[model samples]
Target: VNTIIYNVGSTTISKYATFLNDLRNEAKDPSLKCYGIPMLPNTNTNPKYVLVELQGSNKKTITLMLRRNNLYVMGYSDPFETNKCRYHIFNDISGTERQDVETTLCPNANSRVSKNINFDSRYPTLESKAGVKSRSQVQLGIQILDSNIGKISGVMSFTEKTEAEFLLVAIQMVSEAARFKYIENQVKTNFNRAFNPNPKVLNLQETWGKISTAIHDAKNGVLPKPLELVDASGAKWIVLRVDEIKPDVALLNYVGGSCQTT
Candidate 1:
């Protein structure tokens, strides 16, 4: 349930401070139990929250809550004693109140914590509640320095044009190894010159063959064998589950460079 806190802002500091203490009192000992934990303060580990403020000089306001699935749940409250409302019992978007929440609180609002609030429950919409959605997400905070300082750079994605073609040749060469050595030799000969064959490079084709065999030799298999991502540039590397991979997620990044053998 929602436990209304004070509408604290830069301009209304002193006033919100006094009201905020009152709101804190209400939250600390309400019938619904809203403990202000040192690390996580809110409905226990409440994954989401809502913050509303006066629109303009007139100061008309509405209250809303954020859900674990990144959806915004909006509703109104008595401006004077807003902390008395129960906020968590506002789920189920099919109801009339939900329709009103969508129509009213969603427009012209900013959320650094939400992914998408105005999206439909289709292919890419967030549906998981096990915090799996947070796996692939990353938060970046930026601070601008003086122009005299050095410039910061962002990371780029790898170029797959050459690598993809190389992988295609490698796969084909390995597939025809026993059946047609002539074609396999031709494929490897050409692939070696372009890819610089070595123990590490040669093993790429070998592993590709094993992967291909896994599917081809399986009598009942219908799906293609999943391709594994390994070291592409003959360098030692480690990959962690840094950002979680969610469905319909697209991260087409690029990284470019030249190789200078010592």
Candidate 2:
């Protein structure tokens, strides 16, 4: 097999994109294991992001994206508020910093910049409530993929791979804005379905409980049954912070060659 380097800037993107696209083209079978990390709520520390992995044909990696509008519509954040309730506490450099982040996935016209984010396992990390850093029994949802994102104009190899592969696995210029919007609409619909003057906190709490439970379930198996559980409103009491570095990628060779030669 002819091996090509995953070029990010040099007319190249990176290995993850190549790997993802390779897997995507090869992924004809319906039976595959996919994983999702909850795009936990908009916390004071972390922006709402999800890192999803697809493990079929023996491949696993993540993509980092946001859940902005969902957090707002679900009441985790206020549409009028931009600071603490939103993720990424910014330094006062320019009004552009946050907007720059917003544009990461969005076309320049919609927002200035894309949001900055980091990936931890979908579940909680060490010292976190419900945060079993090692537990592998629960499920998040469908693995987010390139196919999952919407349209943009120019496509570069680096950006494509960044969007497709690197986002899930490592810190890149990617963020999950649209998904939050999609989920926000979904949650609002569910809320309306109840059709009551006053809603029960129990119902909302139950939803988060179910989502949290499924994540626990995903830890043990390759895949769980279709996951319907959602904290339609992103969980507030629970702090959805980012996971620390696992050091796997750190120790591995950062060489820019294909798997065979390197």
Candidate 3:
């Protein structure tokens, strides 16, 4: 059995990507355990740009890509809003002191270098209520992957180990921008179907309720049923897990490589 390496960049990125991959996937079969993933027997070619999956009360899977500072969340591929964002907030310069952050995934495209975005999770923010460190739960959905994300992505290796010996577990990547764009439209449509409406505030409160319920369900210590309960404008969980790293690959590259290794 060959030693499988999830060489996407650093071990941190590998695990971080895994976390996003393991979020509450509405696409997942309800029959299986809440967060358990089937393991793989053999490894696939290592790839770059981890695909992070997100979920909320809406019970649909929201997919996004993370390759360092560039997080191609919904908009980079699909335009959720005509006035949606797809820009960057990075400032790496000389004659300046190092800042706390390197860059962030901006959800707007009002800048010169803009792209598409999926506003599927597009809701309002407590930016006014909670101030600087708050946004709707749908927007902060990716936050849950923290600390636990890497493990989740690995468990879902999914290539069930056959009698054929070892099942190597390796990670995968979404290299083409076209493919990234392609995967999101499906989610956005579903997002609208569940009684869709233009987001602002009242809906934001409903989402928080959803989070509490989600966490409550997970914390079901009593029985098999009545269990219960459950981040930033886009949750700093991405910022936190992806804290201070180095992976060289822009998410918008038409011809990007799998930031992976053997």
Candidate 4:
């Protein structure tokens, strides 16, 4: 492998672009266990950006792009909220005298610039909580790659990672705004499904007593032999296992079920 020397504390646009490419190729190996999503180097688009993958719960994935800039990084994750969903911005200015950093919650065309951020030396991060009920809140961690050649580059690392490889992945995630938007939509959708009232949705809390009564009937051999539970949508489910560990918490599993016919 060809080794390149990076000069720290100095800035170079072209050189920084090349280094990003080298770093991108290095992160291809799975052993690196890269954190967020993998990204590719690009110089074609305006402001030049890096394409990244945003990992979500339940193995869901979204696309994001990290614009090239030594000072700030931005990207979009989803289009649900008029491109305001997964957008994120991070400032990576180092040194003691340099205090306030100009940044934004999201790069929305109507959003205002925020100068209230006070850079923390040890833990450098910025948060954006613009969405409803704070669903759009995102944490971005700044990781400075120091080089022996007296050069430094600011990398965006959102989630914590101990390994260098994983840290690289975390940077990719927060670097793109698209990833944030996508995650924001997911959170919003889940929130609406659970909190927003709809007849199709089930209220387990209100029905827990029924489940407990069935369990009690079973324990006393008073329940039907093929005891089954019906959900709000009229779907039938046979209990695989049920354990009431606490009054508020119950562990239940289903062996089989089918949707009710209209």
Global CA lDDT computed for model 3? 0.23
lDDT of each: 0.26, 0.24, 0.23, 0.28
- What would the per-residue lDDT of candidate 3 be over residues 1-262, giving only the tens digit for each residue? 1111222222343353443244222112222221122111111222222343332222222234333222222211111233332231112221221111111233232422332111122122213222323332222112222212332222223121110001001111222111222222222333222211123222222333232222223322221233221121222221111111111111121112221111
lDDT of 1 at 174: 22
Error of 2 at 67 (Å): 18
TM-score list, all predictions: 0.21, 0.20, 0.19, 0.21
Worst 10 residues of 4 by lDDT: 145-154
Q: Which tens-of-lDDT digit does each residue in 2-114 have in candidate 4?
A: 22232323434344344444434432222111112222222232323334433333222333333332112332232232323333322333442122111222335453322
Off by over 4 Å in 1: 1-12, 25-92, 96-117, 120-262
| Pick by TM-score: 3 or 4, better one | 4
Model 1: per-residue Cα lDDT over 74-167, one tens digit each: 3332222222221212333456545434434443233211212232322113223212232123111111101001110010221222222212
Question: How many backbone clashes can be found in candidate 2?
Answer: 40
lDDT of model 1 at residue 109? 33
Alpha carbon deviation, residue 197, candidate 1 (Å): 49
